[PDB]
Amino acid sequence: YIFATTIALQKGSPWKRQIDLALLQFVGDGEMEELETLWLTGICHNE
Amino acid sequence: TGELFFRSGFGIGMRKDSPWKQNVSLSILKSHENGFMEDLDKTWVRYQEC
Amino acid sequence: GMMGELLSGQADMIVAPLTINNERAQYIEFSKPFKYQGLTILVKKEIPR
Amino acid sequence: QRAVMAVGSLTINEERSEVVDFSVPFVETGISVMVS
Numbered sequence: 001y002i003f004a005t006t007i008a009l010q011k012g013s014p015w016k017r018q019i020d021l022a023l024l025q026f027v028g029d030g031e032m033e034e035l036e037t038l039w040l041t042g043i044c045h046n047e
Numbered sequence: 048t049g050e051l052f053f054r055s056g057f058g059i060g061m062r063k064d065s066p067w068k069q070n071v072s073l074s075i076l077k078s079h080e081n082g083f084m085e086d087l088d089k090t091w092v093r094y095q096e097c
Numbered sequence: 098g099m100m101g102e103l104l105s106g107q108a109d110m111i112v113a114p115l116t117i118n119n120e121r122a123q124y125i126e127f128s129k130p131f132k133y134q135g136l137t138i139l140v141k142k143e144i145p146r
Numbered sequence: 147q148r149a150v151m152a153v154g155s156l157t158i159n160e161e162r163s164e165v166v167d168f169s170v171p172f173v174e175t176g177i178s179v180m181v182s
Contacts, residue, residue, distance in 0.1 A: 002176040
């Protein structure tokens with residue numbers, strides 16, 4: 001249960017749209033879960 | 048059953064030339080920090096059990 | 098639907114639970130989102146013996 | 147402007163948003179409570 005819920009770019013940079021399209025692809029293609037398997041879980045999710 | 052899949056967010060849809068980005072986003076973070084998210088989580092989300 | 102109704106001028110505000118996507122963000126920009134959610138799986142309670 | 151980009155596990159907040167722009171949020175966080 002999460003309470004007080006929910007990348008640094010300088011203003012006016014041309015870099016918002018490109019990085020956003022990139023990261024939404026990386027979300028969209030499951031490599032985020034590969035990252036999860038690499039780094040997240042210890043013992044507790046194997047409760 | 049199971050874990051989540053394709054973990055994303057639910058948000059507002061706006062046009063690119065619409066100037067209503069920034070102040071709207073300000074209000075949104077205000078809603079996140081002032082418990083109004085938790086207010087809706089109580090008033091509509093967390094009541095019901097079987 | 099929604100996306101064409103924004104891009105047609107007939108509709109001007111989406112305030113509704115839409116997911117975030119590449120191709121939707123290619124033309125219509127999101128704000129920072131309300132809820133961080135996703136997909137779950139409906140499986141019934143099977144009847145007891 | 148010692149650096150253009152900064153990554154961290156940076157929390158996304160009001161006074162942070164007042165000055166600078168942000169990517170679509172990378173991962174999910176908020177306030178939790180750890181106990182025995």
